[PDB]
Amino acid sequence: MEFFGESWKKHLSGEFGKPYFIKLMGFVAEERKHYTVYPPPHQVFTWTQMCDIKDVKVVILGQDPYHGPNQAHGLCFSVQRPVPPPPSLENIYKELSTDIEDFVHPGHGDLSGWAKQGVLLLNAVLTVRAHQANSHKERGWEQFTDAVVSWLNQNSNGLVFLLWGSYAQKKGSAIDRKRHHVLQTAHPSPLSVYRGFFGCRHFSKTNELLQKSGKKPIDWKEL
DNA sequence: TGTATCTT
DNA sequence: AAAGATAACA
């Protein structure tokens, strides 16, 4: 048992020997020698440990991990107990409450329950230097997450991609818009939420698009 | 003081 | 690129 889930390691292993990835991991290792980097090494790839790669039905793509202590744990927008939901997640919960009739604030911020149902909780960038948002951008993470999105695009049909924010939206060109459903809106952060996130109804729309393709809907309340 | 996005 | 301007407030 390791950092990468078996099925993800098997299909993404071709990236490991590529120069950008070797250099990216070197950069991250060097950053950890001088600064506090989030999430810890063992949690950078938690998004690969929740379900099999072939069981992915929905992909939520954020910007980068939470940059505060004890927050990021490798699943986008998620925080393990007893850490309270950060601002971006409180906004996700508010949208879910107005979008899904049965949804109420669960009392925690752990999104493992969604990930276990086949919801890939990914960020465009997978590490961040403490207290500095998007500090690890354009270092190689985007090419790796492009590989993840491209694999899902080429080897699956009818997935739902929820691209939240400008950085996540750059992955729109790696997806065949006629074969998969791409939903784009502003990032849920308080700084951008009013630019489209509130009222986007992405959660009900995702379930309707899944049910149309004959696939089982996501139980957003299963947390 | 802190949690994006567009403009210069 | 990086910094300034900007909308939203617990």
PDB file of C-alpha atoms in Angstrom, chain A residues 81 93 96 100 102-104 106 108 110-119 216-223:
ATOM      1  CA  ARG A  81     -12.040  16.172  11.137  1.00  0.00           C
ATOM      2  CA  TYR A  93     -22.202  23.740   1.059  1.00  0.00           C
ATOM      3  CA  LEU A  96     -25.504  22.480  -2.382  1.00  0.00           C
ATOM      4  CA  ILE A 100     -30.169  19.800  -3.670  1.00  0.00           C
ATOM      5  CA  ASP A 102     -32.109  17.081   0.832  1.00  0.00           C
ATOM      6  CA  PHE A 103     -28.700  18.682   1.470  1.00  0.00           C
ATOM      7  CA  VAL A 104     -27.852  20.201   4.851  1.00  0.00           C
ATOM      8  CA  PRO A 106     -22.901  17.821   7.481  1.00  0.00           C
ATOM      9  CA  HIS A 108     -17.601  18.518   8.989  1.00  0.00           C
ATOM     10  CA  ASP A 110     -14.351  15.624   4.863  1.00  0.00           C
ATOM     11  CA  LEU A 111     -15.339  14.936   1.242  1.00  0.00           C
ATOM     12  CA  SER A 112     -14.124  11.294   1.209  1.00  0.00           C
ATOM     13  CA  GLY A 113     -17.740  10.180   0.781  1.00  0.00           C
ATOM     14  CA  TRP A 114     -17.972  11.853  -2.638  1.00  0.00           C
ATOM     15  CA  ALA A 115     -14.618  10.515  -3.752  1.00  0.00           C
ATOM     16  CA  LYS A 116     -15.675   6.949  -2.850  1.00  0.00           C
ATOM     17  CA  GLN A 117     -18.653   7.262  -5.238  1.00  0.00           C
ATOM     18  CA  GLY A 118     -16.458   8.036  -8.230  1.00  0.00           C
ATOM     19  CA  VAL A 119     -16.017  11.788  -7.892  1.00  0.00           C
ATOM     20  CA  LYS A 216     -26.093   6.135 -11.263  1.00  0.00           C
ATOM     21  CA  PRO A 217     -26.311   9.692  -9.746  1.00  0.00           C
ATOM     22  CA  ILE A 218     -24.039  11.011  -6.985  1.00  0.00           C
ATOM     23  CA  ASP A 219     -25.527  11.093  -3.496  1.00  0.00           C
ATOM     24  CA  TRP A 220     -24.106  14.491  -2.481  1.00  0.00           C
ATOM     25  CA  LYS A 221     -25.385  13.887   1.040  1.00  0.00           C
ATOM     26  CA  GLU A 222     -23.272  10.694   1.421  1.00  0.00           C
ATOM     27  CA  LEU A 223     -20.524  12.271   3.563  1.00  0.00           C
TER      28      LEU A 223
END
